[PDB]
Structures are given as structure tokens and as C-alpha cells.
Design a protein around this nucleic acid. Structure first.
Ligand SMILES: [Mg+2]
Lengths: 225, 215
RNA sequence: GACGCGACCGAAAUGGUGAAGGACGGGUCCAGUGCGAGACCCGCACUGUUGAGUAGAGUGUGAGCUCCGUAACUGGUCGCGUC
């Protein structure tokens, strides 16, 4: 019954500003400490800020002091993180979390939202080009072939990839994106299939990048020779 | 001084049913104000232990914590399949709060050699003026693996990027893609493109290659 | 010996006074911990060891005590008066 939902994330340029909100339900924030914790892609948790009940005292990580402001609007049962003077290193999934009741769970954070992605970059929103990774005319590496789709040069994260509108899931591997030196993302999705069906079975990768209004489907087949 | 929390190891491999221990060492007294969390890929952390040694409500008792002065340990007495995850300690003795660096706990299984595939750039991409060459290492264990790119037998450096999947829930292997990025102009001035893979389950390096423009 | 008067002593009490610092306390200051939906603030409880400036970091005419007084008395002693 206790839930936290963060919103307000998205893309912003260096030096810009952004306000995150943390909507509580199933408890009233006035009785708890509320914390913000962030996680850069691939990295660990880093505590950001918190606000204490009854006194409204606020506390901040050195890496954000002076730029960030945590606050709470009890009549919306919502907490906020006002982020100013943002830098590329602030790119992260931002979680809000409830510190539990002292008698029940000490100072542990007993409930967490599912997070909201903040991307700080000067790159502008861009849909990907989707290129085939065509099964080798040779045949196999162990009775089976491999094919896929290359999802190149989009911004920002995330994109979704599925095969045959979801009907094909066994042996699919969709790789985590990498950030290129252009400042754009790229990733590939591959699937292994029986070589004996390459000519008769149909294989389509479904790519959706909502931030750019880009949604495409690519049939992946063998080639001339 | 901000309080440091030094967490070790950064990763460990264990079989289902094994006892494992994770350690977090504080740089000054944090009394018992230490918590442990579990986090699975894509999901929020979950509280396991509070006040250093108290089991959080609903957590299975095979999880325990203990304090020895300023050293703290999380012990799992016998790993179950759903316990493979990343674990974080945290001190909340004083502000600012500090998380440890994290310990990834991965499943140990038998060695599996990768199957290797190479993909030339598509004609469509080439119209755009750039070429991407992709090398795929599929379903291998352990995770350590080396991929080298060769262009007409010259070893490439600084122009490739790698990505590894999470360990597979079913067969407990990893997969890896490596992408070599060249301009169209540079791609067309060479013939033989090759991906060279070394893995524990391979007696000798395996090479996959194609010739530009042939099938 | 009784009663009476007086003086001296003692004396519950009391006006003024000024030293003492944590072994007199504090609804004094501080530190640590627990609790109250509460890491700090606020309240309460516990614990403190050179906690800790003796009259003020105090907007206590605080207790006890020093010194200077006053004193109920239904206490003592001595003198005197009458049997
Ligand atoms: Mg990739």
C-alpha cells in the first residue's frame, strides 16, 4: 500500500534547471524523513538530499550543495528536488525514498520509488537509424545463425526493442546502450535462430524511441550472395 | 570529514546454496546506524538489514548483518536463485549519508565458450558516410573475454566500444557485442575485417572475418 | 519549695549578608542515548566520570552554610520580693 512515484525528469542542457517531484501514497510525508538518492548509469547509489519532519531541516551532499533544494508540500503529499546549474555529471536515475519509522526500521530507507531519468547534455533529441545485422551467408557457428538490428545515433535514452512484435523472445539479446563521443547513444539487438529457417521464417526488429516520435520496424534477411 | 564506507569485494561468484559474506568498513565510528540494500537490474533498491543487525520485516532470515567495531558484514547463509543481485551498505550516523560502492553477486556455473559472429556494415549505413562493424560473443561463461579488431591484420585501438548483457536468468551466461566505428572513406581503403576472441573455454584464439564487398 | 519581677543564656523562627561548581540542588549549562510517526529543532525519560563558569555563560528575592542582627517560647541559670 505504500508507494512513491517520481516525475519531472527528462533532458536539460548544462547550466539549466529542472524540478523533480515525489508523490507519496499510503502514508503522509509529514511523519517521515524523505530522501533523494541518485544512480548514474552503470554506477552505484549516491545520496543526494533529505528533509527532516517537524523541523523542516534539510541536508545535502557536498557534490550538490548550493545548487539543489529539497522541499515538501504536505497538502499535495508530495516532495520536490529543485535542481539548478545542472552539469553533465548530474545525469542519473533519481530515486526518492522514505526513511522508515524509528521503532520499526531504524534509519533504513524502507520504501523507494522506481526512479526517473535525468539527462544533462547539450546534444539535442534525435531518433535512431536502424540498420540490419544480416545473417551470414556462410551459415552458422554451431548449427545456428545470428542476426540483429543496429540502433545507432539516438538521444536521449531510453529506446525499446522487440522482435516479431514480442512473439520472438528466446535467444534474444538486447545490449545496453553506449554513449558515443558524438554525445549520441547506440546499441544493438541480436537473436540466434536455426540456419535452416533463414529463408522461410520472418524476422523483424521493432524499435520505439518515444522522445523523438520515432517508431520503426526492420525486416532482417540474408543478402545477394 | 565525510564518513567513508569501503565495501568489498566489488564482485563475487558463488554457486546456489553457498554461504557468502559482504563487508563494509567505516572510516570512523558510525555506531550501529548501518543499513543494507539489495538491487536487481532495472529496479529500485530494497531494504534488508537496519541498525546493522536487525532483519527488516518480511526479509528471509537467511540474511543477517553483524557489527564488529567499525566493520560491518552482510551474510547470506545459503544463496537461493533470487538472491543474485547487487548489495549496498549505507551509513546514516551523520549527514551527509554514505553508500558503499556495492557488491555484485553473480552465479557460478561451468565454463562455456562463446559462439562468435561478425557483421559487416549495411549498405544503408554506408550511404550516410560511416561504417559500423559488429562482433557478437554469444552465451559464454565466465564473463572475462578479450576481443581484438584487425583491419588488414593491423590491430585496432581506440575506435571500438563493447557492451555486455546481464547474466542470463536461464543458462547463467553472458553475451557481448563489440562495435568498430570507421568513416566510409577509411572503410573502403581496406579489405579484410576481423574479430579475434580469446576466452577461457577456447584452447586457442578464434577469428571471424569477412572481405569487404564479397557476400 | 511555690508564685511573681528582672537579667543573662539557650531557642522553633526570621531580616540582612557572601563564599562555595557539580559530592546541595535546579524548571542552570553541556554531552551521550532512548522515546513521542521526531538523527537536528521541541517535549519527556535515562546516563555522565575535571559532566562544568560559583551568583553568574541566570530575569532563581532556591536549599544548606559563613558573618551581622532580631526573636515566640509553654527552656536553663542567677539575683531580688512575699510565704
Ligand atoms: Mg551494443
Amino acid at each position: 500500500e505504500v508507494q512513491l512515484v517520481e516525475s519531472g525528469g527528462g533532458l536539460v542542457q548544462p547550466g539549466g534547471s529542472l524540478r523533480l517531484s515525489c508523490a507519496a501514497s499510503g502514508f503522509y510525508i509529514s511523519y517521515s524523513s524523505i530522501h533523494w538518492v541518485r544512480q548514474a548509469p552503470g554506477k552505484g547509489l549516491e545520496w543526494v538530499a533529505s528533509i527532516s519532519p517537524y523541523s523542516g531541516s534539510t541536508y545535502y551532499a557536498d557534490s550538490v550543495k548550493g545548487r539543489f533544494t529539497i522541499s515538501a508540500d504536505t497538502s499535495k503529499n508530495t516532495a520536490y528536488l529543485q535542481m539548478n546549474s545542472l552539469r553533465a555529471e548530474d545525469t542519473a536515475v533519481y530515486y526518492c525514498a522514505r526513511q522508515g519509522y524509528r521503532r520499526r526500521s531504524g534509519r533504513g530507507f524502507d520504501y523507494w520509488g522506481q526512479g526517473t531519468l535525468v539527462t544533462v547534455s547539450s546534444a539535442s533529441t534525435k531518433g535512431p537509424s536502424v540498420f540490419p545485422l544480416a545473417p551470414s551467408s556462410k551459415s552458422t557457428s554451431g548449427g545456428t545463425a545470428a542476426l540483429g538490428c543496429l540502433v545507432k545515433d539516438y538521444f536521449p535514452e531510453p529506446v525499446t526493442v522487440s522482435w516479431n512484435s514480442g512473439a520472438l523472445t528466446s535467444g534474444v539479446h538486447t545490449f545496453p546502450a553506449v554513449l558515443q563521443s558524438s554525445g549520441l547513444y547506440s546499441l544493438s539487438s541480436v537473436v540466434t535462430v536455426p540456419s535452416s529457417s533463414l529463408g522461410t521464417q520472418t524476422y523483424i526488429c521493432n524499435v520505439n524511441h518515444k522522445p523523438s516520435n520515432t517508431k520503426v520496424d526492420k525486416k532482417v534477411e540474408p543478402k545477394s550472395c | 570529514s565525510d564518513i567513508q564506507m569501503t565495501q568489498s569485494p566489488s564482485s563475487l561468484s558463488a554457486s546456489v546454496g553457498d554461504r557468502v559474506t559482504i563487508t563494509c568498513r567505516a572510516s570512523q565510528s558510525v555506531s550501529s546506524a548501518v543499513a543494507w540494500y539489495q538491487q536487481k537490474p532495472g529496479k529500485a533498491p530494497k531494504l534488508l538489514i537496519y541498525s546493522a543487525s536487525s532483519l527488516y520485516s518480511g526479509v528471509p532470515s537467511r540474511f543477517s548483518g553483524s557489527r564488529s567495531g567499525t566493520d560491518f558484514t552482510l551474510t547470506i547463509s545459503s544463496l537461493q536463485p533470487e538472491d543474485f543481485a547487487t548489495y549496498y551498505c549505507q551509513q546514516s550516523y551523520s549527514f551527509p549519508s554514505t553508500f558503499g560502492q556495492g557488491t555484485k553477486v553473480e552465479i557460478k556455473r561451468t565454463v562455456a565458450a562463446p559462439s562468435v559472429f561478425i557483421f559487416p556494415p549495411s549498405d544503408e549505413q554506408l550511404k550516410s558516410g560511416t561504417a559500423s562493424v559488429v562482433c557478437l560473443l554469444n552465451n559464454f561463461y565466465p564473463r572475462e573475454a578479450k576481443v581484438q579488431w584487425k583491419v588488414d591484420n593491423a590491430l585496432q585501438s581506440g575506435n571500438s566500444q563493447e557492451s555486455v548483457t546481464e547474466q542470463d536468468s536461464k543458462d547463467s551466461t553472458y553475451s557481448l557485442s563489440s562495435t568498430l566505428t570507421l568513416s566510409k572513406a577509411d572503410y573502403e581503403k581496406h579489405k579484410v575485417y576481423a574479430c579475434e576472441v580469446t576466452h577461457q573455454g577456447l584452447s586457442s584464439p578464434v577469428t571471424k572475418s569477412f572481405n569487404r564487398g564479397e557476400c
